[PDB]
Design a protein around this ligand. Structure first.
Ligand SMILES: [Mg+2]
Ligand SMILES: [Mg+2]
Length: 1264
RNA sequence: AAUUUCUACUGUUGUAGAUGAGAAGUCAUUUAAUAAGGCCUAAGAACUUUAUC
DNA sequence: AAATGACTTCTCTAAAGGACT
DNA sequence: AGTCCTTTAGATA
């Protein structure tokens, strides 16, 4: 029996259920005869375009507003000062000092945009369909732009010009409220609320702090690395981006190149508000590419990086600047060169023809082909025809590659010159070939006779380069046949997967050309003007070579152009919205709205149906029709709902049309006008908010109760309210109104009436369907089927848990693959499970791969609310902790880790620290297939990496991860309930993302946890789901606990002895021979014990420089250990590789000698090198092999019985391997939290931060 | 190898588990290309820093 | 530049009211 | 005047 039986019906949540819709009888033929699906297909395209057209207007409006905005230096400085004082301090004085400063700037920007005339009509019917004889704001702006010759839509292929846009806008004339969701998305762009969709948030919450942090990095930088930035280069390189019209500190409106100090003046933040100012600021930081220049113009960050690598000061990396985030809705245009963009397949073959024809037709000034020239030059190079003191290699990575390519090894050349010159320095930018030959021939007498690198292995490498030109000649053979396949204007066929083998041929030609250019690059001498040192060169060689190199170098933009096109994802049809001619289809189920929102639900013989009324026949279910056609057939749902009580009651009782009937007294109007019935509600317009008065609240509730009982319809809800003196705030009354203002009833409608209206196309009827509704389905249904049926179940309607919401949507999805009969009826099919008792299965029917995608389908997305009458758990974590304190002796800890070998690894631990269960999650259960998901995901990740590199389609991995994790979540939920467990995670495409996704899916499942085997009305069943995590808002709001899930710091959890708590904090790495002689006499004793046959190192961690480390330890040379390298991992024994360190230096320890003095009185440099290396082999507790085998954890610190923990030989209540050890210590950190929860005393806060000292103390001292 | 949809199946016109949609915006990352740089916490069958796209 | 993944916002309404036929 | 699309009403850590 669970400690959690009360954590049920705690808070409400929203969900969507999805179903197929199966048209019934003649509804499909009737739908087709009126062309409703094709018209909605077109409307979805038109609606996307209308929204693109409206956004051009928003783009204009945002620029116009931000050009007007000026934030005062005073407000910015006040922001800056408290921003940096909440660094360094967290006094509550400042926290609302900061919120006040922030909010002053937000209100200022808000007033500016509420000032424009364009704002008032941005979100209403005046935008596109103004009355009365007025022009629509959007139509006007479109006409004005057409008069100013502005071409808004040359940038998107869907819209020809302004006149097509105007047609599109006008086609939505009676359809303004269809835009209501989109208008809410656009209101979010301008909100002053603290939401990240707004330009105000983008300016004040994102970009202002980044700018200020950048100002502080600039001032710190000038103090500590003054010559890092070349101020005169940057003024010349980025003068365009340093130009501004207004200096906001001096306020002069002269347009000039600003100084770096001026851009970081706080007033000039007003120049980085809109997108053009953000891009200027970002270019100052990041430089640009300019067409024609080979070198890239540098920005601030590049100077910071280079100076930091030139003087090797790693501390300047903290000064890297942060880019400002883009402005919301803006288009991005770079200030670096923009490559041409190919648009179709024709552009691909035309662009490649043009390049490879030029390369073939080109002649040098000596009238020779590129191939003839290169053969001529390189054959003469090999024949020693050339003066190799006149030929050079660039002394950069191209020479790095040349050694690594020819001698399989870098720096056989690079090292060979650092020697022959020695036989003070600076980088020589180019190196003679004679210097190369003479240097390495002397380098090869130092070198082994076998391992010897000739100079003419280099001259061989180049004699072979003209080889490539008729491999490329043959590659343009076959490509000529591929070229005609694809030269069609506009067709884009080359993005499809059928073209993959042709694309491989296009890429391999491009890659051979590209490889060719990179091999020759080692010869090219640039015209970048530093002429600080130039060379005397064979001038004929460089004449014709450079001409050839320049022609071939056009491969660079060609390669990018083609990649940027071929790697596009093809266009694919997706499902689209169906409207059945109704702009408010299914917006609300209420009986009074059925004529407007033409959707109706029916039940018949345990099946469910959706009916859509034809627009022309929308009275088909009015009261008269229902009485005249009552009969057995279909049970029509009657839905009554009173939503948003806090808005709906005043709306109705104070309306112009009804206020005289409801007759609120002057007292009631006073309370309303000043909102004294609320704590933080809105007064009426013109009135000031006065303070909450509970007596006023209760008079208002009583006015509401009297008005409800007089209301012609709402009284039929049969409200039963608490006594008004029991309410302490008006939300407690609105909740009772909402809880009870929801009723489902049923009318019986004759089957023949439904049939007749379906046959005539007056009703469109669909069965609501998933496979659980099949007459054959005899298994446990899906959770979502259980929720759906619960909506209408009389046990739910007695006391509503599941509630049906308005704003459902209908979709149509076209067939996307051919109907292939993959497994024909009555032919045996092999079973994949090799452990299955049936090696094959046979069916009386066909089996069709992906059958749902082989025909057109209708769908129904239906929103619901779960726990409809439950009260948000604002103190949910506090309630959990109260329970965990009372029941702390039943609680287990389920801690989950990850690592290289495990997507996730768990340990279940009891209150004493015993492991009860421990295993990897790589293989599930109880999974009959025994799939190793660690191998499966790694195989998908590698296939995706190859697809990117081969320009092939990139498959999805997230569905693969979610499907695996859905089984892990299921296992964790059973373990939580079975063992009264809490779940503990370590705080923090690469599957360490799986760990984060596991957390996310587990939190969501524990928001609302139903066990399908439990009974409907009992704990864990459909009406009483467990809620064990807190309602999820965001991750920043989440903190370190959500319900029974806790996050603990990650440090020191894997490499730590599970018995002694020992951790290597020595960090022994070697450098100086006295620091080592200092390091080792820093011990208490080093000794030998032959009772046991191993050495000892007694020491206290405080006598070493790190004072964080506590405790005296004696570590021992006991046991095996392993080590990797690269040709692989070997096995070593430290307690005897020690004797060879004692044989060469004639130490002797044999009879128990305290050996400490001897090692400190040696100074062979590398006697220490072995000694330090064998000491950290002692501290290496985690020990892995390159094999498929697991890795174990061994401890060099003995327990009280003097035994040494080994994971290979460990009791079941202790870690069985090293990965288990990591999860175990996450769990021990959870035991600490459980002890704080248990020992907390009522009133005071729970401290859940665990510092390492507390952890080390806990782990070191719980055994002793 | 069937699905509201996803994963694994054959569990037999389906079995098991999971499944909050639609709309909007933004950020992050990967891969390629390119520039100037480091280097045997990782690596020349290169590894890697900053930056542009 | 192409691509996928992940995060944060809004809605999940009946009825009053206005414009037009 | 009746119709029907668009706007409206504005709690609660
Ligand atoms: Mg089932
Ligand atoms: Mg499948």
């Amino acid at each position: 029996m669970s400690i959690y039986q009360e954590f049920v019906n705690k808070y409400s949540l929203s969900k969507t259920l999805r179903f197929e819709l199966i048209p019934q009888g003649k509804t499909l033929e009737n739908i087709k005869a009126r062309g409703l699906i094709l018209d909605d297909e077109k409307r979805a395209k038109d609606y996307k375009k209308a929204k693109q057209i409206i956004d051009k207007y928003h783009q204009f409006f945002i620029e116009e507003i931000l050009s007007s905005v000026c934030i005062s230096e005073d407000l910015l400085q006040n922001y800056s000062d408290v921003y940096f004082k909440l660094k360094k301090s967290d006094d509550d004085n400042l926290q609302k000092d900061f919120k006040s400063a922030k909010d002053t700037i937000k209100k200022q920007i808000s007033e500016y945009i509420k000032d424009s005339e364009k704002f008032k009509n941005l979100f209403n019917q005046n935008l596109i369909d103004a009355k009365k004889g007025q022009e629509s704001d959007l139509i006007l702006w479109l006409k004005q732009s057409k008069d100013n010759g502005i071409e808004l839509f040359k940038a998107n292929s869907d819209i020809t010009d302004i006149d097509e846009a105007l047609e599109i806008i006008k086609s939505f004339k009676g359809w303004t409220t269809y835009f209501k969701g989109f208008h809410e998305n656009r209101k979010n762009v301008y909100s002053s609320n603290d939401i990240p969709t707004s330009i105000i948030y983008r300016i004040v919450d994102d970009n202002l702090p980044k700018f200020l942090e950048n100002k502080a990095k600039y001032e710190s930088l000038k103090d500590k690395a003054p010559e890092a930035i070349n101020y005169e280069q940057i003024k010349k390189d980025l003068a365009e981006e340093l130009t501004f019209d207004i200096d906001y500190k001096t306020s002069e409106v002269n347009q000039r190149v600003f100084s770096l100090d001026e851009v970081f003046e706080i007033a000039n933040f007003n120049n980085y508000l809109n997108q053009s100012g953000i891009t200027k600021f970002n270019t100052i930081i990041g430089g640009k590419f300019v067409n024609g220049e080979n070198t890239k113009r540098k920005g601030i960050n590049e100077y910071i990086n280079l100076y930091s690598q030139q003087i090797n000061d790693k501390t300047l990396k903290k000064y890297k600047m942060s880019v400002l985030f883009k402005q919301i809705l803006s288009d991005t245009e770079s200030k670096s060169f923009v490559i041409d963009k190919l648009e179709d397949d024709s552009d691909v073959v035309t662009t490649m023809q043009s390049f490879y024809e030029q390369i073939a037709a080109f002649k040098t000034v000596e009238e020779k082909s590129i191939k003839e020239t290169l053969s001529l030059l390189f054959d003469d190079l090999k024949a020693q025809k050339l003066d190799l003191s006149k030929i050079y290699f660039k002394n950069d990575k191209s020479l790095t590659d040349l050694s690594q390519q020819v001698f399989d090894d870098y720096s056989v050349i690079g090292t060979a010159v650092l020697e022959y010159i020695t036989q003070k320095t600076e980088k020589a930018k180019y190196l003679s070939l004679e210097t190369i030959k003479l240097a390495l021939e002397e380098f090869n007498k130092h070198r082994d006779i076998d391992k010897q690198c000739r100079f003419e292995e280099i001259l061989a490498n180049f004699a072979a380069i003209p080889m490539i030109f008729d491999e490329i000649a043959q590659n343009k053979d076959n490509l000529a046949q591929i070229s005609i396949k694809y030269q069609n204007q506009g067709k884009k066929d080359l993005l499809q997967a059928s073209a993959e083998d042709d694309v491989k041929a296009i890429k391999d030609l491009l890659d051979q050309t590209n490889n060719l250019l990179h091999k020759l690059k080692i010869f090219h001498i640039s015209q970048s003007e530093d002429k600080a040192n130039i060379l005397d060169k064979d001038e004929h060689f460089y004449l014709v070579f450079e001409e050839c190199y320049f022609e071939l170098a056009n491969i660079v933009p060609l390669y990018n152009k083609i990649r940027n096109y071929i790697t596009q994802k093809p266009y694919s049809d997706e499902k689209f919205k169906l409207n059945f001619e109704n702009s408010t289809l299914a917006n609300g189920w209420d009986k009074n709205k059925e004529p407007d929102n033409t959707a109706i639900l029916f039940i018949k013989d345990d099946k469910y149906y959706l009916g859509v009324m034809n627009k022309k026949n929308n009275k088909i279910f009015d009261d008269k029709a229902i009485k005249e056609n009552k009969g057995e057939g279909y049970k029509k749902i009657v839905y009554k709902l009173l939503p948003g009580a806090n808005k709906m009651l005043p709306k109705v009782f104070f309306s112009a049309k009804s206020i005289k009937f409801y007759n609120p007294s002057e007292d009631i109007l006073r309370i309303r006008n000043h909102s004294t019935h609320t704590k933080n509600g809105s007064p009426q317009k013109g009135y000031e908010k006065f303070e909450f008065n509970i007596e006023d609240c209760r008079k208002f509730i009583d006015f509401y109760k009297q008005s409800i009982s007089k209301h012609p319809e709402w009284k039929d809800f049969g409200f039963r309210f608490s006594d008004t003196q029991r309410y302490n705030s008006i939300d407690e009354f609105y909740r009772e109104v909402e809880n009870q203002g929801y009723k489902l009833t049923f009318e019986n409608i004759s089957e023949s009436y439904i049939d007749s209206v379906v046959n005539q196309g007056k009703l469109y009827l669909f069965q609501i369907y998933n496979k659980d509704f099949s007459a054959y389905s005899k298994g446990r249904p899906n959770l979502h089927t259980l929720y759906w049926k619960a909506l209408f179940d009389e046990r739910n309607l007695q006391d509503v848990v599941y509630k049906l919401n308005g704003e459902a949507e209908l979709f149509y999805r076209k067939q996307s693959i051919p109907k292939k009969i993959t497994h024909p009826a009555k032919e045996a099919i092999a079973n994949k499970n090799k452990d299955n008792p049936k090696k094959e299965s046979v069916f009386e029917y066909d089996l069709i791969k992906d059958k749902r995608f082989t025909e057109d389908k209708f769908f129904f997305h239906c929103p619901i609310t779960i726990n409809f009458k439950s009260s948000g758990a604002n103190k949910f974590n506090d309630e959990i902790n109260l329970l965990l304190k009372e029941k702390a002796n039943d609680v287990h800890i389920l801690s989950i880790d990850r690592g290289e070998r495990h997507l996730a690894y768990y340990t279940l631990v009891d209150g004493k620290g015993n492991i009860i269960k421990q295993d990897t999650f790589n293989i599930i259960g109880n999974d009959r297939m025994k799939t190793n998901y660690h191998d499966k995901l790694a195989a998908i990740e590698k296939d995706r990496d190859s697809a990117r590199k081969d320009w092939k389609k990139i498959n999805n991995i997230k569905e693969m991860k979610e499907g695996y994790l859905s089984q892990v979540v299921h296992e964790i939920a059973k373990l939580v309930i079975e063992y009264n467990a809490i779940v503990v995670f370590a705080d923090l495409k690469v599957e360490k993302q799986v760990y984060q996704k596991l957390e996310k899916m587990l939190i969501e499942k524990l928001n609302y946890l139903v066990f399908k085997d439990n009974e409907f009305d009992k704990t864990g069943g459909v009406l009483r789901a467990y809620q064990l995590t807190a309602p999820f808002e965001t991750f920043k709001k989440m903190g370190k606990q959500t319900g029974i899930i806790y996050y603990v710091p990650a440090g020191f959890t894997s490499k730590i002895c599970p018995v002694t708590g020992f951790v290597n904090q020595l960090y022994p790495k070697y450098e100086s021979v006295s620091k080592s002689q200092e390091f080792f006499s820093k011990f208490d004793k080093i000794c030998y014990n032959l009772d046991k046959g191993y050495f000892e190192f007694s020491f206290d961690y405080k006598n070493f420089g790190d004072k964080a480390a506590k405790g005296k330890w004696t570590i021992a040379s006991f046991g095996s250990r392993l080590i990797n390298f690269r040709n692989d991992t070997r096995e070593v024994y430290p307690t005897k590789e020690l004797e060879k360190l004692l044989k060469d230096y004639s130490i002797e320890y044999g009879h128990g000698e305290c050996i400490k003095a001897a090692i400190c009185g040696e100074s062979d440099k590398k006697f220490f090198a072995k000694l330090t290396s064998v000491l950290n082999t002692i501290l290496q507790m985690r020990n892995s092999k390159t094999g498929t085998e697991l890795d174990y954890l061994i401890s060099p610190v003995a327990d009280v019985n003097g035994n040494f923990f080994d994971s290979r030989q460990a009791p079941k209540n202790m870690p069985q391997d090293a990965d288990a050890n990591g999860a175990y210590h996450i769990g021990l950190k959870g035991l600490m939290l459980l002890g704080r929860i248990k020992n907390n005393q009522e009133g005071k806060k729970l401290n859940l931060v665990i510092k390492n000292e507390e952890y080390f103390e806990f782990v070191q001292n719980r055994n002793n």
